[PDB]
Design a protein around this nucleic acid. Structure first.
Ligand code: 3KD
Ligand code: MG
Ligand code: MG
Ligand code: MG
Ligand code: MG
Ligand code: MG
Ligand code: MG
Ligand code: MG
Ligand code: MG
Ligand code: MG
Ligand code: MG
Ligand code: MG
Ligand code: MG
Ligand code: MG
Ligand code: MG
Ligand code: MG
Ligand code: MG
Ligand code: MG
Ligand code: MG
Ligand code: MG
Ligand code: MG
Ligand code: MG
Ligand code: MG
Ligand code: MG
Ligand code: MG
Ligand code: MG
Ligand code: MG
Ligand code: MG
Ligand code: MG
Ligand code: MG
Ligand code: MG
Ligand code: MG
Ligand code: MG
Ligand code: MG
Ligand code: MG
Ligand code: MG
Ligand code: MG
Ligand code: MG
Ligand code: MG
Ligand code: MG
Ligand code: MG
Ligand code: MG
Ligand code: MG
Ligand code: MG
Ligand code: MG
Ligand code: MG
Ligand code: MG
Ligand code: MG
Lengths: 172, 193, 197, 191, 136
RNA sequence: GGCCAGCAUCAGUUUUGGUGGCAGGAUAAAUCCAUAGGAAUGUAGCUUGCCUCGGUAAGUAUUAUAGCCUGUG
RNA sequence: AGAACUGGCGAUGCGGGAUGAACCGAACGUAGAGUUAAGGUGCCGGAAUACACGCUCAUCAGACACCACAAAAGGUGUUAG
RNA sequence: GCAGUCAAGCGUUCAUAGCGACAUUGCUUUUUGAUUCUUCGAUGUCGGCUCUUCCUAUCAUACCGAAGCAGAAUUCGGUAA
RNA sequence: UUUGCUCCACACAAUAUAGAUGGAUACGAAUAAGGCGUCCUUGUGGCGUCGCUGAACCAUAGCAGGCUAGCAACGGUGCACUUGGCGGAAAGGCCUUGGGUGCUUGCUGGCGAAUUGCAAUGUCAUUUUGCGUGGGGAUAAAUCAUUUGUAUACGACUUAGA
């Protein structure tokens, strides 16, 4: 749906005479802008409580920034999704440098592997897998082995003119 | 395959010389009369051609012609033609060729008894020919309006086009044919009662 | 850039080599292409062989002459790929095509001239390593082309002579570099360095 | 998922030097020398020490990796092939017509010439591949033996002899007639 | 009769491999690989050169043959400490790469007149080399 | 002053660059600095076992002869 | 084949969907400059052989609404759960 | 009209050699219907004769796999027009 | 048939142009590997070095490039000659020898340039042909009609005729 920011959204059931000061609920929401974020909020909220936007009020919206944006991190990701023929819970693991990058590629992955578009996906939980060896998916574990090194074989340099006078070479 | 030179013998029988023309009697008979001159100077020009052939040349064919005067035909104008030369080695081949210039080659030197040979020729002609004999289509019944040596259905309605694959009146005969496996039962000799 | 651009077909992908050759013409650039027998097509040999027979069955029912023509030669397989990318039924189209020449091997003129390449169609830069692909010459020879062996013979001959040329040249250029070096450290030489040379 | 690297070892024994440039492999030991083209496959060889060579695949999928081992093996069987060497054993099998098997030569040939198969007046022929040598076993009834340095060449020559003796138009369960491969192994013994 | 087995000797992605960035506000700038994220992303950092600590695609970077000692996941100040200490800049600078980069940047800052002087010089050199190329 | 142009200063419309000053927010989040605590894909040292005179491995071992993480300021 | 509400075609060209009454965009005096729609940008053909992460190898691969079809059932092909 | 999936049965024994109920998913357009879009200022509105070409859901012939294939004979299936 | 043909040379005249405007600047082969230098045991060899683009290399100053002088070099280069040789895939081009000759911006000099008026492609290419001039060279055929029948509806084909 684009390039996400994470937002704390807070809403609460429009006050009333017999109930001034209703209860206040928060959601963290990955959206590309605050407008979509407030929409999503109401979307899941009417999925949990008896409210809808009509009778309720957004109280506060705040972007949350990554705590350590240049720290590499192992993300455990939890998702609910709809397939063509049914709906499905699912756990993936993503390694990147911020919860916001991570959710970008999840949506990418869900779309690429399961043909899940944004409408049809639900983030259950994104959280930092602290101790390695509670990392479970191999395609991640692979990148924790000590003194990791790999070549990047068969190099393709992009030509900037149409013709070339050489014959290239993919050494690297 | 492309031809890259033709070397010619110094003298040339009127028989072949005649082939190079459509009106012999009026003509100044000038054919090959400059080429012949190429022998004069020691040999120079002819050799380098021969020489060239040897260097390149994947195949070699000899220019031969018939002695039609030794033949009861009227037609005087002899026949000339290329014959490939299979005996070994390009260089040996042209030496053979060069050697036989103006000299004369015999059948027994080419064919033996019981040998299977092929015959290449232009078929007898019959001119414009109806479908029934040209293709051996069925005669149509005797009752049929406007002719019966025909084909009833020259095609379905679609392709709305007569097609290349159906019998149609036209020329018959005077076709080229390459006929194989004719066996030599005799190689006769002229000088031989 | 240059009056004529000679392209070593070898190791290029037909429809990418085509797609650039076409544009080049339409923009006024004369082109010759060589070694079209050493041209490539993605997909294993069998796939493109099957593809080619598809092409083979198309023909004018009433008369197989009016119908689609099938050229078997590698240059000519190429030209088909190319012509289809050119509005070849317009003056402007007929014009552009005439700036084009395709050839199996490298026949005279073009063998003493330099040939270039087209990286955005070079196979080794384009195909994912691992994918099966096809050589024009072998494909053509499978559908009728009569002249693979001869081209190969003539080429090996050509490749020899050119190896002499090169060697001869690499010799001379060694001397040049030697000379070019005993002039290093001189004033003129240091001055040029200063100015980027 | 693409594995960032998986690899294998190829041991080298005391008699042989294997030498590999681009992916053209040459193995040379006591029994001679074979060579085999691996260009079609995209692995990286590395010598670690005269008795050890590694083969690895960087950032590869299943089907890729899954060819790394068959590379390790193909190159092993060259090294075993050039030390011990290979020997395939085949026995004739027939239930009435004796299968007459000879070796004949036209123009340097060497051909396995099978006659009287299930009676057949027809005379069968299988060419002897180069590298491979045929010895009709003494002391064993109807045993042919193909031996050589290439597993691939004997195994194939073997399979060519066996297949030339397929049976048609009969229940090939009752008609078991043939020349079958009955033992695969080595030339040099105690092993 | 040893065995002789090629090589194929790739520059590797590894903590402390220095790369020359190619797209973006940095670009032309060197930098060190600090941690490694996946097959296609690494965390880079290049304080000496100005380039911010960031996550980057490998696709936009080109591995150099240079490497120094860096602890995986070392922070910017630490990186600056090792870098200087391992003297990578002089090392890079000395290379043909960097020297060739420098060359063409000069070629492209030449004045028209400077350009003119370049030719007068090449003429000068040509005269004496062409000679020597004719006396042995 | 007939024809067609070039440049300059402006007017209407528009397009494409450079650059200056400010406002928000966790009065951005980081880096950095300070400080407390920690752990391993465990840095020094140490022990032990082979091993061409140290190099390896498998133990201890939380800053030492690398560093990192986490909170607070 | 027959009704309901609206919007259309009929009566209407223009851009897009190769093509096409009705779909998409947009409704028309004669023109300049700009900007867009729907739809596109390898070449045909104006416009990135752009960027980015995955997936897919088909000895009948696939390739954009209306639209020019495919189903049950299976695969130790491969992907992620 | 033709071809499937499930597999209860059939096949002495034995679901699937060869078959296959109750169900059920399809394909075809030489059947017949349903429609009424084109032709009513006219598209010669049975069949046969002739003659071409094309499809394949293959009767024969080439080479194969399978069988409740001993041989002979047959049946099932593949590549095949 | 009114002195015609051809090749080289120049000259006038036309006619064009799918588009000159410093240079199409030659190994091959591999790409999970190469190029170049060097050594040696000449090999799937040792060692060194390069790539990360042709953004290069070469050429490039002078009335669109005039007229002149000199020096240092003995190099470069244009042109017509001559020596030996190689190239047949479409070779029709490449290399080499030797004198002659022009130029040289390798360096240092004398003279010139304006008024094309503040820009106007400001005209420098190469296509094909036509007409005289004189320097080499060469002196046919086909067709109709006639005729044959190995051919033929007519044309066409195949023969024949000083
Ligand atoms: O022409 C008409 C039909 C027709 C009318 C006739 C007639 C024969 C036909 C032939 N039918 C084929 C298809 C056709 C379409 C038309 O309806 C024709 O004989 C007397 O009138
Ligand atoms: Mg946070
Ligand atoms: Mg000639
Ligand atoms: Mg008659
Ligand atoms: Mg008949
Ligand atoms: Mg007859
Ligand atoms: Mg009648
Ligand atoms: Mg008939
Ligand atoms: Mg059978
Ligand atoms: Mg039987
Ligand atoms: Mg004007
Ligand atoms: Mg203005
Ligand atoms: Mg600003
Ligand atoms: Mg360290
Ligand atoms: Mg509507
Ligand atoms: Mg009406
Ligand atoms: Mg309208
Ligand atoms: Mg339109
Ligand atoms: Mg459409
Ligand atoms: Mg087109
Ligand atoms: Mg375009
Ligand atoms: Mg762009
Ligand atoms: Mg849809
Ligand atoms: Mg399914
Ligand atoms: Mg599956
Ligand atoms: Mg049941
Ligand atoms: Mg049973
Ligand atoms: Mg039963
Ligand atoms: Mg029917
Ligand atoms: Mg009617
Ligand atoms: Mg009518
Ligand atoms: Mg009709
Ligand atoms: Mg009628
Ligand atoms: Mg078909
Ligand atoms: Mg079938
Ligand atoms: Mg049974
Ligand atoms: Mg079968
Ligand atoms: Mg048929
Ligand atoms: Mg067919
Ligand atoms: Mg023109
Ligand atoms: Mg090297
Ligand atoms: Mg060398
Ligand atoms: Mg070496
Ligand atoms: Mg260069
Ligand atoms: Mg001058
Ligand atoms: Mg040519
Ligand atoms: Mg001067
Ligand atoms: Mg004259």
């Amino acid at each position: 749906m684009a390039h996400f920011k994470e937002y704390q959204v807070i809403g609460r059931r429009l006050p009333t005479e017999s109930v001034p000061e209703p209860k206040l609920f928060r959601m963290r929401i990955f959206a590309s802008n605050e407008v979509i974020a407030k929409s999503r909020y109401w979307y899941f909220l009417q999925k949990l409580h008896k409210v809808k936007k009509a009778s309720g009020e957004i109280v506060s919206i705040n972007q949350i920034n990554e705590a350590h944006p240049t720290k590499v991190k192992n993300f455990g990701v939890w998702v609910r999704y709809d397939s063509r023929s049914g709906t499905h819970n699912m756990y993936k693991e993503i390694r990147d440098v911020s919860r916001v990058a991570a959710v970008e590629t999840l949506y990418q992955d869900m779309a690429a592997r399961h043909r899940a578009r944004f409408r049809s996906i639900h983030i259950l939980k994104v959280a930092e897998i602290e101790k390695t060896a509670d990392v479970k998916r191999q395609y991640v574990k692979q990148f924790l082995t000590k003194d990791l090194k790999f070549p990047l074989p068969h190099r393709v340099q992009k030509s900037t003119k149409t013709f070339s006078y050489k014959r290239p070479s993919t050494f690297y | 395959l492309r031809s890259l030179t033709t070397v010619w013998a110094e003298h040339l029988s009127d028989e072949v010389k005649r082939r190079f023309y459509k009106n012999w009697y009026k003509s100044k008979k000038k054919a090959f009369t400059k080429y012949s001159a190429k022998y004069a100077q020691d040999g120079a020009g002819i050799e380098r051609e021969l020489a060239r052939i040897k260097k390149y040349a994947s195949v070699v064919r000899v220019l031969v012609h018939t002695q039609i005067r030794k033949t009861p035909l009227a037609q005087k104008k002899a026949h000339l033609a290329e014959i490939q030369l299979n005996g070994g080695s390009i260089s040996e081949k042209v030496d053979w060729a060069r050697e036989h210039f103006e000299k004369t080659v015999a059948v027994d030197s080419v064919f033996e008894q019981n040998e299977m040979i092929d015959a290449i020729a232009v078929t007898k002609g019959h001119g414009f020919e109806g479908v029934t004999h040209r293709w051996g289509t069925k005669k149509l019944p005797r009752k049929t309006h406007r002719g019966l040596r025909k084909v009833a259905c020259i095609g379905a309605w679609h392709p709305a086009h007569v097609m290349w694959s159906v019998a149609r009146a036209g020329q018959r005969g005077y076709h080229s044919r390459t006929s194989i496996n004719h066996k030599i039962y005799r190689v006769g000799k002229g000088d031989d009662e | 850039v240059e009056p004529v651009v000679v392209i070593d077909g070898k190791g290029h992908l037909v429809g990418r080599l085509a797609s650039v050759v076409a544009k080049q013409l339409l923009n006024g650039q004369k082109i010759v292409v060589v070694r079209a027998e050493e041209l490539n097509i993605s997909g294993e040999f069998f796939r493109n062989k099957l593809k080619y027979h598809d092409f083979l069955r198309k023909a004018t029912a009433f008369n197989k002459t009016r119908g689609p023509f099938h050229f078997r030669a590698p240059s000519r397989i190429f030209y088909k790929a190319l012509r289809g990318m050119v509005s070849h039924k317009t003056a402007r189209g007929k014009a552009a095509l005439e700036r084009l020449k395709v050839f199996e091997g490298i026949p005279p003129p073009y063998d003493k001239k330099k040939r270039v390449v087209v990286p955005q169609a070079l196979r080794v830069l384009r195909l994912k390593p691992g994918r099966k692909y096809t050589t024009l010459g072998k494909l053509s020879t499978s559908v009728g082309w009569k002249y693979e062996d001869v081209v190969a013979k003539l080429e090996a001959k050509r490749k020899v002579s050119s190896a002499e040329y090169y060697a001869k040249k690499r010799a001379f250029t060694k001397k040049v570099a030697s000379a070019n070096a005993t002039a290093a450290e001189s004033d003129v030489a240091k001055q040029l360095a200063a100015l980027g040379y | 998922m693409k594995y960032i690297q998986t690899e294998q070892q190829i041991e080298v024994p005391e008699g042989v030097t294997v030498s590999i440039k681009s992916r053209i492999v040459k193995v040379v030991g006591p029994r001679g020398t074979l060579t085999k083209n691996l260009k079609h496959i995209d692995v990286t060889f590395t010598k670690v020490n005269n008795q050890l060579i590694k083969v690895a695949v960087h950032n590869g999928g299943r089907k890729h990796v899954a060819a790394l081992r068959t590379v390790k093996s193909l190159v092993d069987n060259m090294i075993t092939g050039v030390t011990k060497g290979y020997k395939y054993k085949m026995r004739y099998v027939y239930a009435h017509f004796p299968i007459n098997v000879n070796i004949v030569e036209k123009d340097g040939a060497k051909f396995i010439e099978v006659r009287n198969f299930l009676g057949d007046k027809k005379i069968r022929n299988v060419p002897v591949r180069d590298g491979v040598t045929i010895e009709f076993s003494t002391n064993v009834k109807d045993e042919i033996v193909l031996s050589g340095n290439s597993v691939e060449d004997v195994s194939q020559n073997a399979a060519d002899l066996q297949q030339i003796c397929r049976v048609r138009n009969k229940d090939i369960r009752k008609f078991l007639d043939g020349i079958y491969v009955s033992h695969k192994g080595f030339i040099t013994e105690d092993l | 009769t040893d065995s002789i087995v090629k090589a194929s000797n790739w520059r590797l992605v590894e903590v402390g491999r220095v790369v020359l960035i190619k797209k973006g506000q940095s670009a032309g700038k060197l930098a060190a690989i600090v941690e490694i994220i996946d097959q296609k992303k690494v965390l880079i950092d290049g304080p000496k050169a100005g380039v911010p600590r960031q996550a980057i695609n490998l696709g936009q970077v080109v591995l150099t043959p240079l490497t120094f000692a860096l602890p995986r996941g070392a922070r910017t100040a630490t990186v600056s400490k090792k870098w200087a200490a391992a003297a990578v800049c002089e090392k890079w600078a000395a290379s043909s790469w960097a020297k060739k980069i420098a060359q063409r940047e000069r070629r492209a800052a030449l004045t028209d007149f400077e350009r003119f002087q370049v030719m007068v010089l090449r003429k000068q050199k040509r005269y004496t080399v062409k000679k020597a190329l004719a006396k042995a």
